[PDB]
Symmetry: C6
Subunit: 248 residues, 6 copies
């Protein structure tokens, strides 16, 4: 209430405004990290593939699960049948190895757009994953195999479970992400826990906060897989995994 | 009083002059670190924006709070709606990503020019901040959410509170600045506490010493938020935060 | 079961499909790491060499066992007789020093294509190996000399033995691979156990999972060499080696 | 006294000469490190400035005390009034940022040429110094504020005090120099105590050994400031500071 | 005995062949590391030098023993007489500083081609060696001076002594090689024991395995020097040296 | 005595020759490290300088003692009188900053050519030396000031004293050389004791082994300075210094 300049007064009165929380949360969601647009990816696949899109997509996802995004490098070190088919799919769908643009269709983006399929496939193919049971068995007992892939973050619910459940599932999953990031990213070779976490913090939060894949389907699927119990809280293995990550 | 040359005598007599403290403090304030001119920023926004400037500014501040200054990089990884609006605002206001000049309007400069609004918005949007409750909860209990942003330094008062209060508030805030600097600045990756502090010492002191945002408004606002008690000393959470930083 | 968009519904229904495990394992095998095609190598050798191919191949394998892949560098530091013959063989078979392509015939690829011969030859020539009994005797007692070469991975069976046996043999062999990788690869100079393992994980798993060299021949050969006992479990030396690697 | 060659004999007889100590000390003083010529600096200032030189010089010194030598960089981050005046002074006096030549007028050289004024001004402006009471209060209690600047070395006497007093004052001052060197010089980031000392050893000894600023004026000034007691030995704070540096 | 493809069968039958050990050891010797051809060196020296070759060779060997291979660099820092003669010898014999080719005559190659002379000369000139008694006296007592040079490896016998004796002599010698490698090779500056050993493993084994210098002459010479006792086992000093290397 | 080839026999018989020790020591001295030719330096100085050469040389030596070899860099930071005279001397004698050639006259080479004068001058000017009593007083008590310079090595005798005395004097001197090397050579910044020793081992041994400056003059001078006692063994201070270096 002391005398001030007209520019100071503007700053002061600006800050006396009430916050419009609905509007501020809209803005914050529009400006938040987004790693991919799953509806865009699926639309591109289906429109290009027609009646072959489902079978084609499954093959691309197995590649993403087991070899990642590096199409050319990987195709040089794989069976002839696998390489021929992967190269043909790349030409057919315009697959690329890096997400340069919203339009970029990478194998990992395809996997993340269909997360319930991808994570079931990961569990089924757990013996083929670069970071799978062998690695996780050294860290804890009974790491959920559905968590051993880049798509599991999209299946962690925010609605229909407690915030403690959400946090625990994120931590349990971080145990795999931490390991996968370190094995596959050479820039993380000497990084601290906090540094490797920050390399996947934004993509993980974006996957969890996404509205594309409905929370109720996530909860029901996690219950069916036993990752959540019938009461909607994490299984013992999930709690052990989460504890292991917090302790890391 | 021994014989000396005429040049030595000049140096000696120069040093026998009394100091004009009023004049010396004027000089020292004119020459001190200044990071931005808030009146200049607000004038530019209001003159360009007219009756849209307030709503536009709020959106720019949410961006600054949650994504920082990197307009192009961030716009590549966000919703279409957010990116379209941010790009349009950049063209409209001439927003830039680095403070090259007094005239450079960066998103962070906009936030710092309206600090009471920005810090209230930060608390409201604390779950969206890159360095927010999750990080600070690992360090101490109940870190004030209003301190979780680049603008809080401007709200630390020098008049109307004790110097011990000023120092405590600076230390409590440094706990967040230290963390934020380390997460966002890769050059600080292996830096000591003292090195990361020195990266923000001058901007912080300049914010605290600024005459643009009146001290009495700062005190009243900190009391309203509970960061200061009714007696004008820091809350327990502020003291705990400050202790944690001194101990770091 | 809540209302959702048509793109969300597609993702949801995609994930409600049953997995075709036979088809998914086919895909995963086609896309898995493959380091070489042994039938291709042998066909090239035999078609080029005719009735000289066997004797020629044995000489190339001794080179691979004792000097590795670096044809030019090694030929500069060896007897005249050895160098002359190696250079002539290189011209004759189109030998190269790096596996650039499926077609690239490297000395190590030749050795790996004939693994029972190569590993018997390694044991016979153990005093000539760069990483042989002297190195392994410092780590454990009685390291199997047949394991002291790049081809042993192809002789670890997956069928006809328990999975515990397979795992133990892989670990026992890793003790040599770990040492060999460190001595020969300068990029691994400061690498952790996990980092050097990951440098040979994919080639090792590919050798073990290969269908080219029949599992029943592997089991019978390991029994004949005493690496497996008559009951089909690993010898004591193999168990000690495996324990040493786990403990490393 | 054994037979030797005529060249050996010359070397031997050269070394049998008596030393002319007066002449040798003259040579050693002429060849010793010199960082600046204060009479030259003052002459340039006064001849250029005329009746404005005193007020102009005081402003340049406040800049040197608080911002150092980096005229352009600092002027980009300061008030408009400060920047305008500093730039005008640079043009007027030919100020430069690095001492390339005896003629180079840097802000720090100006401060060092008028050391009693500069150190009194430093104490008066101690709350504005980049390395001031906050930093020194963490190291010891009651660090003399007159020592918190680049000019204090010129005020350490060699005549009129004991050599133990001279040494103690140099050590007490080194405590600040050590800290200032580390904060401002990034090349010293990982340097040992001995390495950072050697970065200022020659300039410090040259300041102490300079004949420009008379020893008797130094002693009298240090007594007036309480840095020396009436008996001409260092105050308790000086002894504590010196002990802290020796212990560092 | 299960059905397999014709390419698999070829690999299987290839491995059922008996090994021809005589032939395999011939191949392994032809392909083994060879560092130099001593007969070639001696032939070149004698044919170029005629009746001056012996005296010339002795001078070249003293250079190799005391200064190594760096002819130009060393000649810049030595007496005029030494430099003039060394340069003339270089022109006369085509001496070079690096073994680029079988034909390259380096000073060290000359020394290694005449190893009994070289090692006797090393002992005689032990006070002139860069790595001599001063260095070795810090490691153990009574290090054999004949071992203090690059040629001693050629005098370690494989026939006429036990394999334990051969191994002990190699280890005793490695104590000097380890030290010499570290002092002269700057790339080994931070290398581990194993890394510096691997830098000389192949040259050392090649020297020991060479058939050029007869084993019976080696044994007799080592007995004459007391490095072997009359029973053909290593002296106490050799055992102490070997123990010191194993313990290093 | 077994049958061998004619080239082997030549190598064997070469090694059966008796050593001519007088001739071998001549060769080893001619080929040994030599850092400078003092007679050449003195001849150049005297022939150029005529009757001014003595006074000129003394000035150059004071420069070498206090500032080293860096003529241009040092002249930029010294009194006008000193710089003018040094530059004139450089032109007059063709002084250079690096010993590129036998002919190169560096200030340090001049000092080393007249070592008894230089070391007496060093003691006289000990308060002006970059590495003097202040540094050495931290290491031991009463370090001989005559040892605080680059020329002292030339005054360590090999004849007229015991070898234990020679060794002790070398070690005592190494304590200063070690310190001086570390302060002045930035490449030695993280070097081990052994690495910094090896940087001056050859120059030191060459100075001690030089025949230019007669041993009897050295002994007599060290006795006159008290570095040797009347019995020709090192003073207590020398023994303490030597012990300190061995312990370093």
């Amino acid at each position: 209430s002391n005398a001030m300049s007209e520019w100071s007064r503007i700053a002061v009165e600006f800050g006396e405004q009430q916050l419009n929380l609905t509007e501020l949360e809209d803005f914050a969601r529009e400006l938040a990290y987004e790693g991919l647009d799953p509806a865009l990816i699926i639309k591109k696949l289906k429109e290009t593939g027609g009646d072959d899109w489902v079978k084609d997509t499954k093959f691309i996802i197995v590649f993403a699960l087991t070899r990642g995004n590096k199409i050319v490098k990987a195709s040089g070190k794989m069976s002839n049948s696998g390489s021929k088919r992967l190269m043909a799919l790349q030409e057919k769908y315009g697959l690329v190895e890096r997400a340069e643009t919203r339009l970029s269709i990478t194998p990992v983006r395809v996997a993340q757009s269909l997360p319930t399929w991808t994570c079931a496939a990961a569990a089924a193919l757990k013996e083929y994953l670069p970071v799978g049971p062998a690695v996780m068995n050294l860290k804890v007992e009974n790491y959920p195999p559905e968590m051993m892939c880049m798509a599991f973050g999209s299946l962690i619910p925010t609605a229909g479970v407690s915030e403690a459940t959400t946090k625990t599932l994120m931590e349990a999953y971080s145990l795999w992400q931490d390991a996968f990031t370190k094995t596959i990213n050479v820039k993380m070779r000497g990084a601290s826990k906090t540094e490797v976490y920050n390399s996947f913090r934004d993509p993980l939060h974006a996957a969890v906060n996404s509205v594309f894949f409905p929370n109720d389907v996530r909860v029901k699927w996690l219950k069916a897989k036993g990752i959540l119990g019938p009461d909607g809280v994490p299984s013992r293995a999930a709690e052990v995994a989460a504890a292991a990550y917090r302790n890391l």
